[PDB]
Amino acid sequence: RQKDEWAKKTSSLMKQLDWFIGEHLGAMLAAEALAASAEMRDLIEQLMNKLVEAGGDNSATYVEIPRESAAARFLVRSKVAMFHPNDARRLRLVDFGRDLDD
């Protein structure tokens, strides 16, 4: 099958993203850098792992977030994640993977 290429592409891309987060983003979030990179990658991992875990249940895809987490603010400002309307301490990814003809 063509399946492990979609797995090879995703393991490759996931390493490129983590490089970008460590080398460029964590520094920007400081204004320590290493601490910012680790928490942004944990948060993106938790965000993505759940979005698929729901499959259809759009309501379950919210993770708990510390009150003033800069990672979440950046992810919401970059339009990769959304706060819950009723309260801003849970947080979901935008669901890029869902497609009508997927």
Binding site: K79, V94, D99, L100
Partner: protein, 214 residues
């Protein structure tokens, strides 16, 4: 004759205006006149895009003059397109919103001349996530309307555009884009964009006709 002018503009681009041993306006007008007459080659386009897209000491009037006379001879590369796309939105590296609207207008007017029109499809999410920016929204919608194919009409973009239409009180440029969306998915709940400058279109066509000569 043209690469000499760009070499001058590039050097003046590096030093502030009052430290220039010559006023640049005369040399910007020579470049403007040459571009109106001959167009801009693929390579000249790429150098001009850098001057329009990177932070330098050029003034807004001179940049707008260049942008308005950026008639390509022959084609438009991905290198050029992406530079204008990377210019868009807010950030200390990016140009003014007013020039951004001109670049977006330009991309619509040269859309038919891209070597690889698909490259705009590969950055579709970069264009789309900027629809909130009112200062460039009309030009964004027109370009998005040319770029949209079925693979781009995803549920999260359908919902985002509907929310933005409601919160702006119904931008007609947003509903024009939603019309394009509906052409791919009629299930959706319900300006046909015209060319933004016909005389520029006519002048480009004249320049472009030289490509049949040999």
């Amino acid at each position: 004759g043209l690469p000499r002018l760009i070499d001058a503009i590039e050097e003046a681009s590096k030093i502030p205006a009052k430290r220039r041993q010559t006023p640049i306006k005369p040399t910007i007008e020579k470049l403007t006149t040459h571009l109106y007459t001959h167009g801009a080659s693929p390579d000249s386009l790429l150098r001009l895009a850098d001057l329009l897209t990177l932070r330098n000491h050029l003034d807004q009037a001179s940049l707008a003059a260049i942008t308005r006379n950026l008639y390509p001879s022959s084609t438009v590369s991905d290198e050029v397109v992406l530079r204008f796309i990377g210019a868009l939105g807010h950030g200390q590296l990016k140009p003014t919103l007013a020039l951004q609207a001109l670049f977006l207008r330009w991309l619509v007017m040269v859309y038919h001349l891209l070597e690889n029109p698909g490259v705009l499809g590969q950055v579709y999410g970069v264009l789309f996530d900027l629809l909130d920016t009112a200062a460039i929204r009309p030009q964004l919608c027109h370009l998005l309307a040319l770029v949209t194919r079925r693979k781009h009409v995803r549920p999260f973009r359908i919902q985002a555009i509907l929310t933005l239409s409601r919160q702006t009180g119904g931008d007609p440029n947003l509903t024009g884009l939603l019309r394009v969306f509906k052409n791919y998915y009629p299930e959706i709940i319900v300006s046909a964009f015209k060319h933004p400058d016909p005389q520029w279109r006519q002048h480009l066509d004249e320049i472009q006709q030289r490509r049949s000569e040999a």
